[PDB]
Design an enzyme around this catalytic site. Structure first.
Site, PDB file in Angstrom:
ATOM      1  CB  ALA A   1      -1.025  -0.036   1.228  1.00  0.00           C
TER       2      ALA A   1
ATOM      3  NE  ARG B   1      -6.379  -1.661  -3.399  1.00  0.00           N
ATOM      4  CZ  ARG B   1      -6.061  -1.800  -2.119  1.00  0.00           C
ATOM      5  NH1 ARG B   1      -4.818  -1.646  -1.688  1.00  0.00           N
ATOM      6  NH2 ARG B   1      -7.022  -2.131  -1.261  1.00  0.00           N
TER       7      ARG B   1
ATOM      8  CG  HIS C   1      -1.294   2.768  -3.817  1.00  0.00           C
ATOM      9  ND1 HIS C   1      -1.004   2.426  -5.116  1.00  0.00           N
ATOM     10  CD2 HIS C   1      -1.624   1.614  -3.185  1.00  0.00           C
ATOM     11  CE1 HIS C   1      -1.164   1.120  -5.275  1.00  0.00           C
ATOM     12  NE2 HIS C   1      -1.548   0.602  -4.119  1.00  0.00           N
TER      13      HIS C   1
ATOM     14  CG  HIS D   1       1.925  -3.561  -7.668  1.00  0.00           C
ATOM     15  ND1 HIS D   1       2.007  -3.187  -6.345  1.00  0.00           N
ATOM     16  CD2 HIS D   1       2.408  -2.519  -8.392  1.00  0.00           C
ATOM     17  CE1 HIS D   1       2.519  -1.970  -6.272  1.00  0.00           C
ATOM     18  NE2 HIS D   1       2.760  -1.540  -7.498  1.00  0.00           N
ATOM     19  CG  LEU D   2       1.244 -10.468  -5.229  1.00  0.00           C
ATOM     20  CD1 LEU D   2       0.753 -10.831  -3.807  1.00  0.00           C
ATOM     21  CD2 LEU D   2       1.896 -11.682  -5.925  1.00  0.00           C
ATOM     22  CB  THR D   3      -3.791  -7.200  -7.648  1.00  0.00           C
ATOM     23  OG1 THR D   3      -3.397  -5.996  -6.956  1.00  0.00           O
ATOM     24  CG2 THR D   3      -4.014  -8.376  -6.612  1.00  0.00           C
TER      25      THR D   3
HETATM   26  C1  LIG Z   1      -1.108 -10.334   1.751  1.00  0.00           C
HETATM   27  C2  LIG Z   1      -1.311  -8.916   1.142  1.00  0.00           C
HETATM   28  C3  LIG Z   1      -0.740  -8.598  -0.082  1.00  0.00           C
HETATM   29  C4  LIG Z   1      -0.884  -7.360  -0.703  1.00  0.00           C
HETATM   30  C5  LIG Z   1      -0.342  -7.015  -1.902  1.00  0.00           C
HETATM   31  C6  LIG Z   1      -0.624  -5.734  -2.328  1.00  0.00           C
HETATM   32  C7  LIG Z   1      -1.434  -5.046  -1.403  1.00  0.00           C
HETATM   33  S1  LIG Z   1      -1.749  -6.036  -0.037  1.00  0.00           S
HETATM   34  C8  LIG Z   1      -1.985  -3.647  -1.599  1.00  0.00           C
HETATM   35  O1  LIG Z   1      -1.936  -2.911  -0.355  1.00  0.00           O
HETATM   36  C9  LIG Z   1      -1.445  -2.961  -2.883  1.00  0.00           C
HETATM   37  O2  LIG Z   1      -2.428  -1.974  -3.236  1.00  0.00           O
HETATM   38  C10 LIG Z   1      -1.287  -3.992  -4.045  1.00  0.00           C
HETATM   39  C11 LIG Z   1      -0.195  -5.021  -3.661  1.00  0.00           C
HETATM   40  O3  LIG Z   1       1.070  -4.314  -3.627  1.00  0.00           O
HETATM   41  C12 LIG Z   1      -0.075  -6.134  -4.732  1.00  0.00           C
HETATM   42  O4  LIG Z   1      -1.025  -6.415  -5.471  1.00  0.00           O
HETATM   43  O5  LIG Z   1       0.994  -6.715  -4.773  1.00  0.00           O
END
Ligand SMILES: C/C=C/c1cc2c(s1)[C@@H](O)[C@H](O)C[C@]2(O)C(=O)O
Ligand SMILES: C/C=C/c1cc2c(s1)[C@@H](O)[C@H](O)C[C@]2(O)C(=O)O
Ligand SMILES: C/C=C/c1cc2c(s1)[C@@H](O)[C@H](O)C[C@]2(O)C(=O)O
Ligand SMILES: C/C=C/c1cc2c(s1)[C@@H](O)[C@H](O)C[C@]2(O)C(=O)O
Ligand SMILES: C/C=C/c1cc2c(s1)[C@@H](O)[C@H](O)C[C@]2(O)C(=O)O
Ligand SMILES: C/C=C/c1cc2c(s1)[C@@H](O)[C@H](O)C[C@]2(O)C(=O)O
Ligand SMILES: C/C=C/c1cc2c(s1)[C@@H](O)[C@H](O)C[C@]2(O)C(=O)O
Ligand SMILES: C/C=C/c1cc2c(s1)[C@@H](O)[C@H](O)C[C@]2(O)C(=O)O
Ligand SMILES: C/C=C/c1cc2c(s1)[C@@H](O)[C@H](O)C[C@]2(O)C(=O)O
Ligand SMILES: C/C=C/c1cc2c(s1)[C@@H](O)[C@H](O)C[C@]2(O)C(=O)O
Ligand SMILES: C/C=C/c1cc2c(s1)[C@@H](O)[C@H](O)C[C@]2(O)C(=O)O
Ligand SMILES: C/C=C/c1cc2c(s1)[C@@H](O)[C@H](O)C[C@]2(O)C(=O)O
Lengths: 153, 152, 152, 152, 153, 152, 153, 153, 152, 152, 152, 152
Positions: free
Chosen positions: I79, I113, I82, I102-104
């Site tokens: 986070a 985001r 951002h 980023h994973l997502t």
């Molecule tokens: C177990 C939590 C993992 C997270 C990853 C991420 C989060 S929270 C978020 O706080 C961020 O907006 C997106 C992010 O960096 C990602 O998709 O890798």
């Protein structure tokens, strides 16, 4: 002490519509729960319940809290929370304690629900506890009115 | 000429609440001041006063004006000034002089008071003079109407 | 009492240009109307008129007001209403009554006319009545001053 | 070192109006405080003071700083800070060090004071220290001029 | 025909400051180039040149284009282009053709240069050609005034 | 006078990285320059220096300034200036003079640097003078502390 | 020298639709006026005219200005001026002088016409002179290409 | 049941600074009032109190609410309410009930206090009741955890 | 070459919470996958893994990278992507390759985001591939470094 | 498996224009690098390359993908990334893996490049690695497809 | 009556992709439903159908409606509704009735779908009724054409 | 089918005021046109008409549609379309089909008319066809009700 409970537009449809979003407990049921809260607490509180879909009826009711009959208001303005500068002004003008309640967390829904003109005018806001928020407001109001009484004496 | 004075939400609480913001003269006291302004000026003006907290009662009243009784409106829409497109529209469709009055200077308060849908729909706006603003509006309405009957 | 009437940029072109927007009465004709309003009312008012296209000449003139000659200002800042924080500030520091007047309804034109730094700094604002707005301002200033001398 | 101190609109009203916001020290007193600071530190600095309510006089004066007379400018543009792209460009085109000073903290007042077109054009900006800020600027100006000369 | 060339704040510093951004050709040199453009074209044009750093002087000058002496204006308002609603109104009120010129492309610089109150009030805008833009404005103005004359006859 | 100098995140990398933007003078060198300034003006001032990349350590340290040890703070919050409402509140709650310093002109860089929550909470703000800004702050801090004591 | 005149979407309807807003002179008539401007000036200019309602055709054409055949472009991108980052990039990438022309003053119309991605990419912009703006662009382009030639020699 | 009370940055200065804005009752006093609320109610609640000025310590603590030791959290994130997407994510990820408390009405103060990333992640928000809001949160949490228990059985 | 893998706030909760959003592979499982990618490729890469919920620990670690041990960073700031100008700045001053993962897909979630201060400061950004994104970053970092040593 | 490589507007000008921004490797050279990545890896991947400046040709091609020939798309929409809701929608309706690649870091350029309708519609986005980004996308697409056939 | 039905980008994928959002009825089926509606009401109407993913083909087609062949257009511009000022201008310049249809309620989806440049140029707009909306448009088009002719 | 037609504020002034914008056909005439449309197509539909200037009467009436009397609503909320979250919620909670109609194209007027909270809550929206839009709505309502019943 007399506490006025004002319920705004659409609240009369509680329990009857969109249970998923606003719950199965009806408005008449919330008000009986508030009365049982008083009875069980042995609080010196007389509740009056008023629901309306009219902005003007809400304002008229708030103004009627002029006379030394009602000491405090617990209000769920519904969607007028987000739009009614007129109810917010009526709250400011009332000069009695007013507490705002929302069943849902209006920080966690559409962007258009985030602003609360009315809530900004109220001393306190409670949101996202469903029906329980109203018993939380009672508890709060009783404490606030007792503390006001101590200070006057 | 018949002039209709419309006072919107909360205006009936004047002089009973928040005196440091809205003053100590009540709504009844403003209206008797407007009457004295007429009488003492021998103006040919018949005032009608209306207060309400209901947006729809304001619209109803503006529409009721359509029938050759009422010739102009002096309106303080209160908080509805900033929010009611519906009253702005009623003003637009009324097809006669409307002056908006505000007790306070709505350019000098919260940002949310700066927009006036209704005032944008009126010929003229007066704000910040307290109760005197309504006498200013009367002076204007009488000159506006006078000038309208000559041009007809 | 001495009242100073300040007319900002372009106001001197009144009645010579864009009549359908700003009317046919010239700036000299408005000022002689204000004089007649005084005379015909036997008001104890001495008017001074000032027009300029210069922001700094307006400030200079507001500051020149400080010395117990001038008691109130009636100002139409023109386009500087929307842009001049410097004149707003001069108004704030002047420490006497200032009324803003606009010929047109500045809520009902381009979006860039809606902001008024100066009007936010004045006690009262009048807009949309054409020239009559200046007579409305005179009526107000005289009542404001009258009421100020009684309270002192 | 010939250093030009330019004071913008309303600044000549210092101490005479709104003491609660801008202090009781007058513009003339601030300029004596600057001379006292130059003495009691033996800065080979000659000050020239200029106040005006005219944007164009400020630009004329900055342009005058072309000839190898004035080596740097200390400026408080007043409200023109927030509005004058023209003064900001004059600063940029001047090619001499300029330092902006504000008496108040313009991050801590109205939203319309936060922008400074001028400050952005300057080498540095000082705010919120009252009259002392001008001495702080002197200190920096003498230093900046020294650095430039060592480099020369 | 008389054409008034108004040059706004900072323009008098052309060629003397920031050559890189605004060029080496001075304001006095641009005006001689405009006069040579007329002379060589044998245009029936009398040019008057006026520069000022004062908003009020610009407005006073525009208003002086009232009398049947000046037929058109070519203006570079400088930074007042972006800020002066008062000059924009003076242009609107003038009721003679006005052409706006910028040396630089004010679409391609800081965001605060993009708005032109004045340029919106003008019949036409020319930007980003350096000094040449002024000869482009002359050409345009001559054509516009001739076309206005034909239409009146 | 015990004066606490707080240096925020990334500041310990001064002189070691990006000399073109933030200079070649290191944080340690700036702190020696501050001591030299206290000497060569005989300020009865004892400096304490603290650098951290932790927001919470800055808040812990500001809170430590509660006990009648430290009389004022000179702070460069780094990038936390633009983001930390928590440090701004700690400043507000501290009830001792705080002065903010930036090496660069934060009106003249990216749009995201223009906001300073911290600067707004401070009595004054200095920017764009490089290391000298810290001495300018000292100058103001000693003065502010004097004024407060004369008043005491 | 070869100058490419690119006319964007809807321009082919000039003179045929909405005369009041864009005029009675047709696109084919503007192009003949440009050719007569050359002929009368004895300019060493060969004009090529290209109109299209396709963004992709405009970009393809600009890229074809690669080979040492076309020296400069005069473009009216139409409504793509306000929306096409892709044409703006093609202009930037072309590395030949490009001049933007608008018939109308796009500062004085809807708010959505004020942004010109393309115009920001061009060396210069001309707007609000109707058809004349295109002869103004020619004049400008000839001067710019001659000045580029002098500098190379 | 174990309820974790997390108090964010600056809260440790309660009662000691700016009494006018946040009150005379100190953080240690609020926590004793919460314990007396439990004792008097005979609630099966064990409270743990944690204050910190560190975002990372708050997140670490919330993650420690993983193990079947703590059932619910009552949080006043302070100024991190408005800025910390990281605490909001930690709350979302926790999958235990979290209630947000503010002493003041954050709808009625600076515009920068209106957004609450954290509060949007919480099931409920209570604001503007001073210290009482924390007893209101307890009452709420006890009811929520009992209702969760009934539903599981 | 030494590559430092920095995992920001909440990342340690992977595979234990919100599996439908962030998947079922834990942070330890991603890191052993990255190790296998190295081993199985006989890459001359020495990985170091670091997770923290503290913004300041991230900055400390980026600055600790300065000393000729670590050659590039692969960072998922969580986070803080951002919100943290302070980490963006640390990245800028680090003076070596940094890839953000980023994973997502952070363009396809809440509006808050979409901004990435940190990613704007990195040479490259990878998002939306889940854990595979870290192997993609390794592939990139090794090619980037390889290509950097050849160009030196 | 068949993988379709779509290159949007201006991409064909690579290596011929603006080398300091987009590099010296041409579009044909990137595509032969992707082929070598496949061959040298003995991946069971059949690449098809398509470039166009036409938004509609891109949509046509994405829709042509529907028929069990093509299994995934690797797309660089160029400037259409920021403007084309129509291509975003085509991606959404295509019902197979799409990876977006950008040569540059579109978070670190003009504000108008930050929005990506298309990238929001893709599973993953890669930006800022230059040509290597396309090999990164290939690695991803092959792992994504592999993993999809196992799960079926 | 010759009525041209223009279907914008992605519309040819109706029924074939994302049935949950846009339905299972194909574009071909919608066009048969329109013919059935013309029959079972004996509208002297001849339909012409045209689908494309090209903005320029839509503009070319609208321009083709110049010659007294086609009397009105029924258009679903797809995503070009939100982005194409060029198609909106083509609509404006056409000088024949145009009616816009959307299958979905574009007030009830993403924020980027709410703007319709095209819809604003049209005489009326229909949304949220699925395929039926096209018949609703036919109904209105026949009526509009009748009114125009009675007036002729 | 019992179908409730709700007409919002100012709608009763149709034909009586501003014919150039809203037409010369009165509300009563529109309702006769709807009955004529039900006849000449033998829709087993019984219409009920309700006009009001009160937001709360509209909400009361929508709630009345709870009992298995009224199967659908056709609503023109007037200016409440742009302002009433309360009516939008009443629509949402009603759980019967609702269809919004506007006489004018609310994408083609003032910026403040473009938002429709109500329209967004409705199944579909019709605008810009004048009185005919109400018949278009009837057509869709009968169809929607048929589909729902076939499904039943
Ligand atoms: C177990 C939590 C993992 C997270 C990853 C991420 C989060 S929270 C978020 O706080 C961020 O907006 C997106 C992010 O960096 C990602 O998709 O890798
Ligand atoms: C039966 C409807 C109850 C409603 C409650 C509320 C509504 S509608 C809404 O109109 C408002 O946004 C939030 C609200 O006040 C709440 O959560 O209590
Ligand atoms: C007794 C309350 C009087 C009010 C007047 C007004 C109110 S409330 C406000 O709601 C409105 O913003 C301004 C206003 O119309 C005015 O100054 O006249
Ligand atoms: C002859 C020009 C008169 C003007 C008056 C005004 C102008 S220009 C405008 O520049 C300003 O926006 C409105 C204004 O102050 C008014 O209506 O009185
Ligand atoms: C006597 C007035 C002094 C003023 C100073 C200033 C004013 S007005 C303001 O117009 C400006 O916003 C801030 C300012 O430059 C400052 O704090 O020094
Ligand atoms: C010597 C200064 C010339 C300037 C010209 C201009 C300036 S400053 C600027 O103040 C303005 O933004 C653009 C401008 O008018 C132009 O490009 O001609
Ligand atoms: C070695 C880094 C020093 C920095 C200083 C600053 C940074 S980073 C920035 O993060 C901040 O925006 C401005 C700043 O406080 C300053 O100019 O002093
Ligand atoms: C026959 C149509 C000509 C048009 C020209 C233009 C259009 S449409 C518009 O699409 C654009 O906003 C401005 C414009 O390029 C111009 O004024 O030249
Ligand atoms: C001693 C400080 C207490 C604070 C409480 C709060 C602060 S600072 C603020 O940083 C926050 O905006 C609101 C707040 O959480 C509250 O009202 O409880
Ligand atoms: C030869 C031109 C290549 C371009 C690539 C791109 C362009 S233009 C741009 O139009 C786009 O904003 C970014 C981009 O997709 C990328 O970095 O890959
Ligand atoms: C097979 C795709 C159909 C689409 C229709 C539409 C799309 S995509 C969208 O691109 C557009 O926003 C809305 C739209 O025009 C509609 O609802 O009819
Ligand atoms: C006699 C007035 C009719 C009105 C209709 C409407 C009004 S006012 C407006 O208040 C609204 O914005 C649009 C509207 O719903 C429509 O076009 O049908």
């Amino acid at each position: 002490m007399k506490i006025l409970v004002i319920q705004g537009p659409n609240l009369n449809m509680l329990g009857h519509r969109d249970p998923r979003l606003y719950g199965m407990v009806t408005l008449d049921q919330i008000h009986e729960i508030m009365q049982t809260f008083v009875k069980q607490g042995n609080l010196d509180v007389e509740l009056e319940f008023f629901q309306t879909n009219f902005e003007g009826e809400i304002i008229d009711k708030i103004q009627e809290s002029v006379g030394s009959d009602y000491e405090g208001i617990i209000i769920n303005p519904g969607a007028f929370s987000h739009t009614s500068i007129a109810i917010a002004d009526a709250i400011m003008l009332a000069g009695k304690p007013v507490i705002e309640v929302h069943l849902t967390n209006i920080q966690a829904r559409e962007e258009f629900r985030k602003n609360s003109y009315t809530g900004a005018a109220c001393g306190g806001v409670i949101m996202g506890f469903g029906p329980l928020g109203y018993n939380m407001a009672l508890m709060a109001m009783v404490n606030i009115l007792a503390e006001m009484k101590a200070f006057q004496e």
